[PDB]
Design a protein around this ligand. Structure first.
Ligand SMILES: [Mg+2]
Ligand SMILES: [Mg+2]
Ligand SMILES: [Mg+2]
Ligand SMILES: [Mg+2]
Ligand SMILES: [Mg+2]
Ligand SMILES: [Mg+2]
Ligand SMILES: [Mg+2]
Ligand SMILES: [Mg+2]
Ligand SMILES: [Mg+2]
Ligand SMILES: [Mg+2]
Ligand SMILES: [Mg+2]
Ligand SMILES: [Mg+2]
Ligand SMILES: [Mg+2]
Ligand SMILES: [Mg+2]
Ligand SMILES: [Mg+2]
Ligand SMILES: [Mg+2]
Ligand SMILES: [Mg+2]
Ligand SMILES: [Mg+2]
Ligand SMILES: [Mg+2]
Ligand SMILES: [Mg+2]
Ligand SMILES: [Mg+2]
Ligand SMILES: [Mg+2]
Ligand SMILES: [Mg+2]
Ligand SMILES: [Mg+2]
Ligand SMILES: [Mg+2]
Ligand SMILES: [Mg+2]
Ligand SMILES: [Mg+2]
Ligand SMILES: [Mg+2]
Ligand SMILES: [Mg+2]
Ligand SMILES: [Mg+2]
Ligand SMILES: [Mg+2]
Ligand SMILES: [Mg+2]
Ligand SMILES: [Mg+2]
Ligand SMILES: [Mg+2]
Ligand SMILES: [Mg+2]
Ligand SMILES: [Mg+2]
Ligand SMILES: [Mg+2]
Ligand SMILES: [Mg+2]
Ligand SMILES: [Mg+2]
Ligand SMILES: [Mg+2]
Ligand SMILES: [Mg+2]
Ligand SMILES: [Mg+2]
Ligand SMILES: [Mg+2]
Ligand SMILES: [Mg+2]
Ligand SMILES: [Mg+2]
Ligand SMILES: [Mg+2]
Ligand SMILES: [Mg+2]
Ligand SMILES: [Mg+2]
Ligand SMILES: [Mg+2]
Ligand SMILES: [Mg+2]
Ligand SMILES: [Mg+2]
Ligand SMILES: [Mg+2]
Ligand SMILES: [Mg+2]
Ligand SMILES: [Mg+2]
Ligand SMILES: [Mg+2]
Ligand SMILES: [Mg+2]
Ligand SMILES: [Mg+2]
Ligand SMILES: [Mg+2]
Ligand SMILES: [Mg+2]
Ligand SMILES: [Mg+2]
Ligand SMILES: [Mg+2]
Ligand SMILES: [Mg+2]
Ligand SMILES: [Mg+2]
Ligand SMILES: [Mg+2]
Ligand SMILES: [Mg+2]
Ligand SMILES: [Mg+2]
Ligand SMILES: [Mg+2]
Ligand SMILES: [Mg+2]
Ligand SMILES: [Mg+2]
Ligand SMILES: [Mg+2]
Ligand SMILES: [Mg+2]
Ligand SMILES: [Mg+2]
Ligand SMILES: [Mg+2]
Ligand SMILES: [Mg+2]
Ligand SMILES: [Mg+2]
Ligand SMILES: [Mg+2]
Ligand SMILES: [Mg+2]
Ligand SMILES: [Mg+2]
Ligand SMILES: [Mg+2]
Ligand SMILES: [Mg+2]
Ligand SMILES: [Mg+2]
Ligand SMILES: [Mg+2]
Ligand SMILES: [Mg+2]
Ligand SMILES: [Mg+2]
Ligand SMILES: [Mg+2]
Ligand SMILES: [Mg+2]
Ligand SMILES: [Mg+2]
Ligand SMILES: [Mg+2]
Ligand SMILES: [Mg+2]
Ligand SMILES: [Mg+2]
Ligand SMILES: [Mg+2]
Ligand SMILES: [Mg+2]
Ligand SMILES: [Mg+2]
Ligand SMILES: [Mg+2]
Ligand SMILES: [Mg+2]
Ligand SMILES: [Mg+2]
Ligand SMILES: [Mg+2]
Ligand SMILES: [Mg+2]
Ligand SMILES: [Mg+2]
Ligand SMILES: [Mg+2]
Ligand SMILES: [Mg+2]
Ligand SMILES: [Mg+2]
Ligand SMILES: [Mg+2]
Ligand SMILES: [Mg+2]
Ligand SMILES: [Mg+2]
Lengths: 59, 155, 117, 101, 138, 113
RNA sequence: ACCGUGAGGGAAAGGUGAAAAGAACCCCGGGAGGGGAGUGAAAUAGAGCCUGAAACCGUGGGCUUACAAGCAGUCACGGCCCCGCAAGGGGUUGUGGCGUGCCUAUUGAAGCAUGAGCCGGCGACUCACGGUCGUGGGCGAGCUUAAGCCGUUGAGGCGGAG
RNA sequence: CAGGUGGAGCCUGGGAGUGAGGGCGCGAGCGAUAACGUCCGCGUCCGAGCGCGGGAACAACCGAGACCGCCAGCUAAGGCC
RNA sequence: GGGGGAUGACCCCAGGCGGUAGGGGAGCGUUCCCGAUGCCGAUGAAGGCCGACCCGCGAGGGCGGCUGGAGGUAAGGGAAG
């Protein structure tokens, strides 16, 4: 309601131009050692993930 | 009108510093649901057309029909006793085959009953003779006891 | 009887919105910004039709004043030549002749300086 | 061999077998017209003065016409002045037959 | 009859001497050359002009006291960032700019105005790459 | 031969969910699944369900084989918005609109020779 | 309903189909919703239901754009895409020329003066009775009825106070 | 007394709007032989010609009174590296 | 305006045709009434969405395609929310 305020409605062009960087990036995934499923790196891939460190076993 | 509408007479907002526009009551014509400016009220569309003119026109209207031979005086008919089938029978023997609209002018109550219902017949009493009905109907069919009255109307 | 706006207003707006096809931003979407733009375009066309006549002649001249500068000649004199030469031809427009018919132009150059040299 | 004709305060480069649009003429679509007015011969050397007194070119009227309408509008800001007028320039379509040199 | 309009035509190359030639006088010509306004198929909306090469650009003569009195200015976006440069220093520091600048300002402004300027190779003294032709002239 | 699912009137703002949908347009249903799984966005939950429903629709309804289908077309449209009053300082009162999504996922068959 | 202590103020909100025949069953889903099946002449008539415009938001395609600068258009040319035998036309825009929004109020506004986010719908020269001109007709040293009375399928006539 | 047939004049009537002007030239007053000042007079343009050309750009300075179309021609002011 | 006796809305000829406040003149369209016991309409009303086409100076009127699914309403007049 107060002090500074927009002087002109921003055009459809100029707003969507602002959005030019709002695009997402798909998660970086890697094939899992044991299980065939895909999982993100350096994480205990959720299906018996490791070997030396407890693999939060789904087993 | 804004005075005949249902709403209060209260001013809707202060008038200044409200940041809004500027109003009184919501019965004003600018408002949706407000009164109606210069809309219609009940009124009498009649006037008194000069009688000398009513005559003339009635006369001329008949003339015009006669001038083209579409006028016809007849006597007693014969197809009376108020029954459309009976009239319809007489009409045939008279030329009126319902190929063109007829204005039947007669004082006889029963003949009118008989014709009334024909989609090509407008039936009327003799003292009812008016020019509008003449000009709508192609043919003009009167009886003698109806030509007499019409005759004394003019002049 | 009450004659509501009905259908009439939407139609006039459609007519103009169509004339405004292809304009930028709202100038082609909003009836108002569209109508304002058309006003402009209406006067531009009219003025630009009267000055399309100018812009071409201007072009013709430059084209000419170059082909006869090839034959040692001011456009200014060339024209005076033809004036006195009686040659009321060229019709400046017809100097694609100077481009399509060089020999026919050269001969005109001769008849040009032939008079008043 | 081309010619430079003048019809309707305008000069054109007429070749034989050429279709040309011109200011509307007073000659029903059947007739054939030589515009006894010529300005330049294609094999050159023939130019002289306004018109070559001998040459004329024959064209046949293919029919009269009306060009696509241009909408000529006028608007004066802040004075409530608008005018809309439709315009089609009447023409005549000619076929250039013979260039009588 | 539509007016004739040239197709891709010929990329011409022309060589000029400069030495002894005034400056603006030479610039005038180099401009008209830059935008083929000598060509009878001149076209304003296309750029069908000659590529111009100029050598001995530093031996451009010039009248009056212009070596001292004529100054080229340059404003950086900053405060007091208006620099003033006299002919003498320019020539002694960056000739071929004195002439380049005289032509830049005589070509029309616009995206096409530029580009035409690009078709202009000014060099100090003699010499230059001789890939194309170079019908020298006056 | 294509197969589509459509979630209508999903209580989520289009702009928000339209962002994860763009994350999978044209992808092989195998990626599309792995992507949504590990995308950190409320939007993924809903799109997954629609994508999955569109899959089932392909096999159990149109004969397509869960092994040759990709996301051919996908789009989310704005459904009717839930208007709500937001009490504001100095007695003001605004209206936030909880917006609505119409998620569409259409599946095609990969040209697989 | 809601607002107001109260007197009081005071809204929004209509329409599936001829007929519920208002979608058994199956699939995805926790549901919602959707996909087949089925009903129907029609289901973008499916119950957030006749028609379904505009602003507004999307997906796909054609043309176009990262050394150019502007009331955004216009006049030219040229490219690329589409229609057509054809000549021609439609779409887009690269360059070149020209180019100070609309309304309002003012001596004067692009104006750094007013009003307008945009779209759709509502929104302002009326009616009565008198008057004064003009005009179309009737009758003209005359012209005309008012209230009423009679008549009347929306039929007219009478009525001379004035 | 003559020429002058003109969107001239005169007479009777219906409808108005305007009654805030402005720049420039010339003639004066006021002012300071100040003001894009002010007040009159006679003219003009802008007003309403913010349409067109020139004057770099610019209501009133110069040219010129825009019914429509032309990828024709002659000119006005002003110009022609 | 003057002609040619078609007397208009025809062909000639010659002139005028920037424009605010305003005056005047012609038309276009919307709702309703007479025309309608009629005519158009499921072989598709109104409305909607396109159109590079046709007619008119213009306001508009046609015509064709798609949508829509039950109304619409000539010529000539009449009245206005
Ligand atoms: Mg966009
Ligand atoms: Mg009340
Ligand atoms: Mg009340
Ligand atoms: Mg009241
Ligand atoms: Mg009160
Ligand atoms: Mg405000
Ligand atoms: Mg209300
Ligand atoms: Mg009401
Ligand atoms: Mg009345
Ligand atoms: Mg009465
Ligand atoms: Mg009475
Ligand atoms: Mg009957
Ligand atoms: Mg009604
Ligand atoms: Mg209205
Ligand atoms: Mg375009
Ligand atoms: Mg001219
Ligand atoms: Mg000449
Ligand atoms: Mg000889
Ligand atoms: Mg303006
Ligand atoms: Mg003004
Ligand atoms: Mg409080
Ligand atoms: Mg309470
Ligand atoms: Mg209470
Ligand atoms: Mg509804
Ligand atoms: Mg029902
Ligand atoms: Mg029903
Ligand atoms: Mg289940
Ligand atoms: Mg279902
Ligand atoms: Mg089905
Ligand atoms: Mg069926
Ligand atoms: Mg259907
Ligand atoms: Mg379905
Ligand atoms: Mg439909
Ligand atoms: Mg719907
Ligand atoms: Mg339906
Ligand atoms: Mg709805
Ligand atoms: Mg229905
Ligand atoms: Mg619907
Ligand atoms: Mg797109
Ligand atoms: Mg650069
Ligand atoms: Mg570039
Ligand atoms: Mg910028
Ligand atoms: Mg532009
Ligand atoms: Mg083009
Ligand atoms: Mg084309
Ligand atoms: Mg440009
Ligand atoms: Mg441009
Ligand atoms: Mg410019
Ligand atoms: Mg004011
Ligand atoms: Mg003021
Ligand atoms: Mg003031
Ligand atoms: Mg501004
Ligand atoms: Mg202010
Ligand atoms: Mg403003
Ligand atoms: Mg004010
Ligand atoms: Mg205003
Ligand atoms: Mg404001
Ligand atoms: Mg607001
Ligand atoms: Mg509106
Ligand atoms: Mg009265
Ligand atoms: Mg009166
Ligand atoms: Mg009684
Ligand atoms: Mg005299
Ligand atoms: Mg006068
Ligand atoms: Mg008088
Ligand atoms: Mg008076
Ligand atoms: Mg006063
Ligand atoms: Mg005064
Ligand atoms: Mg004064
Ligand atoms: Mg004055
Ligand atoms: Mg004065
Ligand atoms: Mg001034
Ligand atoms: Mg003097
Ligand atoms: Mg002074
Ligand atoms: Mg003054
Ligand atoms: Mg003067
Ligand atoms: Mg004024
Ligand atoms: Mg002026
Ligand atoms: Mg004047
Ligand atoms: Mg200005
Ligand atoms: Mg100007
Ligand atoms: Mg100027
Ligand atoms: Mg000027
Ligand atoms: Mg004039
Ligand atoms: Mg003229
Ligand atoms: Mg000349
Ligand atoms: Mg001179
Ligand atoms: Mg100069
Ligand atoms: Mg006559
Ligand atoms: Mg004339
Ligand atoms: Mg006028
Ligand atoms: Mg008049
Ligand atoms: Mg009308
Ligand atoms: Mg009826
Ligand atoms: Mg039928
Ligand atoms: Mg049927
Ligand atoms: Mg149909
Ligand atoms: Mg209706
Ligand atoms: Mg139409
Ligand atoms: Mg239809
Ligand atoms: Mg159908
Ligand atoms: Mg009707
Ligand atoms: Mg109608
Ligand atoms: Mg009518
Ligand atoms: Mg009204």
């Amino acid at each position: 309601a107060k002090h500074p305020v927009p002087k002109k409605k921003t055009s459809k062009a100029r707003r969507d131009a602002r959005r030019s960087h709002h695009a997402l990036t798909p998660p970086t995934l890697v094939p899992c050692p044991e299980c065939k499923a895909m999982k993100p790196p350096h994480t205990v891939c959720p299906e018996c993930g490791y070997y030396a460190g407890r693999k939060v076993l789904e087993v | 009108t804004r005075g005949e509408v249902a709403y209060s007479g209260r001013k809707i907002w202060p008038q200044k510093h409200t940041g809004r526009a500027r109003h009184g009551d919501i019965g004003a014509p600018i408002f949706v649901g407000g009164g109606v400016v210069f809309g219609p009220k009940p009124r009498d569309y009649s006037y008194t057309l000069p009688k000398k003119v009513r005559k003339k026109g009635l006369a001329m209207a008949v003339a015009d029909r006669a001038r083209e031979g579409k006028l016809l005086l007849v006597e007693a008919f014969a197809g009376v006793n108020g029954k459309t089938k009976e009239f319809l029978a007489w009409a045939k023997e008279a030329g009126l085959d319902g190929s063109e609209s007829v204005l039947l002018v007669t004082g006889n109550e029963l003949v009118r009953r008989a014709a009334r219902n024909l989609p090509w017949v407008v039936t009327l009493a003799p003292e009812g003779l008016n020019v509008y009905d003449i000009v709508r109907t192609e043919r003009l069919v009167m009886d003698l006891d109806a030509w007499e009255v019409f005759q004394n109307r003019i002049g | 009887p009450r004659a509501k706006t009905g259908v009439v207003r939407r139609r006039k707006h459609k007519k103009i919105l169509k004339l405004a096809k292809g304009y930028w931003g709202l100038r082609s979407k909003s009836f108002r910004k569209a109508r304002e733009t058309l006003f402009a375009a209406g006067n531009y066309a009219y003025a630009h039709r009267k000055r399309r006549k100018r812009d071409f002649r201007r072009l013709w001249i430059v084209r000419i004043n170059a082909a006869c500068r090839q034959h040692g000649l001011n456009y200014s004199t060339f024209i005076h030549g033809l004036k006195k030469a009686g040659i009321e031809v060229d019709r400046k427009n017809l100097a694609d002749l100077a481009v399509r018919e060089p020999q026919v132009f050269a001969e005109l150059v001769e008849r040009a300086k032939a008079a008043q040299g | 061999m081309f010619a430079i004709v003048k019809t309707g305060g305008k000069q054109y480069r007429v070749e034989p077998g050429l279709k040309l649009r011109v200011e509307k003429l007073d000659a029903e679509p059947g007739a054939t017209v030589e515009l006894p007015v010529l300005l330049l011969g294609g094999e050159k050397t023939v130019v002289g003065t306004p018109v070559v007194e001998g040459a004329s070119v024959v064209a046949e009227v293919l029919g009269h016409g009306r060009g696509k309408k241009i909408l000529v509008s006028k608007f004066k800001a802040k004075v409530q002045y608008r005018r809309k007028k439709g315009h089609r320039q009447p023409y005549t379509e000619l076929l250039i037959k013979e260039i009588r040199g | 009859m539509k007016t004739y309009v040239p197709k891709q035509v010929e990329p011409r190359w022309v060589l000029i001497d400069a030495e002894g030639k005034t400056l603006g006088r030479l610039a005038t010509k180099i401009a008209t050359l830059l935008r083929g306004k000598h060509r009878p198929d001149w076209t304003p909306n296309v750029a069908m002009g000659d590529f111009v090469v100029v050598v001995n650009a530093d031996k451009i003569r010039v009248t009056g006291k212009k070596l001292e009195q004529k100054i080229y200015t340059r404003y950086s976006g900053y405060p007091g960032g208006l620099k003033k440069i006299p002919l003498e220093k320019m020539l002694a520091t960056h000739p071929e700019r004195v002439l380049e600048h005289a032509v830049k300002g005589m070509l029309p402004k616009g995206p096409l105005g530029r580009r035409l300027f690009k078709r202009l190779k000014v060099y100090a003294g003699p010499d230059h790459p001789h890939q194309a032709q170079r019908p020298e002239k006056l | 031969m294509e197969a589509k699912a459509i979630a209508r009137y999903v209580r989520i703002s289009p702009r928000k969910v339209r962002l994860v949908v763009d994350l999978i347009r044209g992808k092989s249903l195998e990626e599309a699944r792995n992507i949504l799984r590990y995308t950190n966005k409320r939007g993924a939950y809903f799109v997954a369900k629609v994508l999955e429903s569109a899959a089932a629709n392909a096999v159990n309804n149109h004969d397509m084989l869960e092994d040759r289908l990709y996301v051919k077309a996908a789009y989310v449209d704005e459904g009717p918005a839930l208007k709500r009053v937001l009490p504001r300082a100095r007695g003001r009162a605004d209206i936030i609109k909880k917006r609505t999504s119409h998620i569409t996922v259409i599946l095609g068959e990969k040209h697989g020779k």
